[PDB]
Specification:
Layout: H1 28-37, H2 53-56, H3 61-64, H4 72-75, H5 94-103, E1 125-129, H6 142-154, E2 159-165, E3 170-175, H7 178-188, E4 211-214
Antiparallel strand pairs: 1-3, 1-4, 2-3
The protein binds zinc ion (ZN).
Zinc ion (ZN) is lined by residues 71, 73-74, 79, 81, 85, 87, 89.
PDB class: splicing
Keywords: csmp, Zinc Finger, splicing
Assembly: monomeric
């Protein structure tokens, strides 16, 4: 259990671009967009960092300091603080979500303004696009592709239903809880769908990262 270990450091500070911003801060998007644009290709970059929930999740100072919000850098595999982090480093669970419900209805699980409030039904469904590209056009059949989407998303929260739609090169992932959809959107954006066992793994950065958006 994540409760029985310290959160792992995911990256060294020196691997990240300077002027590291606060996750809820004024400049986060300027900084992150600049980061993204530094990568080659015209299509969405494939992030060199990734959350590995089992390996990475653990206690942080946030767990002991009354923190209710989750670490955005953690979700993206790029928190350099590990157990020093004042935000949470685990996958949101029912208990966390209950506490968040009492605390706010305008902020997401990361402490940012909710998407719905700047453009009653809580949206818990994500559109996942660019699947073929995130596999470097590997020849997989639908059963295999579905298994991969299910695997990576199910480790980010309780899944209500998942659908892979071959004709549209996309998937739809509906979570039981909005908090997990919020978390998973940040975790999976720009990710590869390749696995270490794939012949293509070493060349994963030549793909195009997953497109993950709120579904209609
Ligand atoms: Zn963190």
């Amino acid at each position: 259990s994540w409760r029985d270990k310290s959160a792992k450091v995911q990256v060294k500070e020196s691997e990240l671009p300077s002027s590291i911003p606060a996750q809820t801060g004024l400049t986060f998007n300027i900084w992150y967009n600049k980061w993204s644009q530094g990568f080659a290709g015209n299509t969405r970059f494939v992030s060199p960092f990734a959350l590995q929930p089992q390996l990475h999740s653990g206690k942080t100072r946030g767990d002991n300091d009354g923190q209710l919000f989750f670490c955005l850098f953690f979700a993206k595999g790029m928190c350099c603080l590990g157990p020093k982090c004042e935000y949470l480093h685990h996958i949101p669970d029912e208990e966390d979500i209950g506490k968040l419900a009492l605390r706010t209805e305008v902020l997401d699980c990361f402490g940012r303004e909710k998407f719905a409030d700047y453009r009653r039904k809580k949206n818990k469904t994500l559109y996942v696009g660019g699947i073929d590209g995130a596999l470097n056009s590997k020849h997989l059949k639908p059963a295999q592709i579905e298994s991969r989407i299910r695997f990576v998303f199910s480790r980010l929260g309780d899944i209500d239903r998942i659908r892979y739609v071959e004709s549209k090169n996309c998937g739809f992932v509906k979570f039981k809880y909005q908090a997990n959809a919020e978390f998973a959107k940040e975790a999976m954006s720009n990710q590869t769908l390749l696995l270490p066992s794939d012949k293509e793994w070493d060349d994963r950065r030549e793909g195009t990262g997953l497109l993950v958006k709120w579904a209609n």
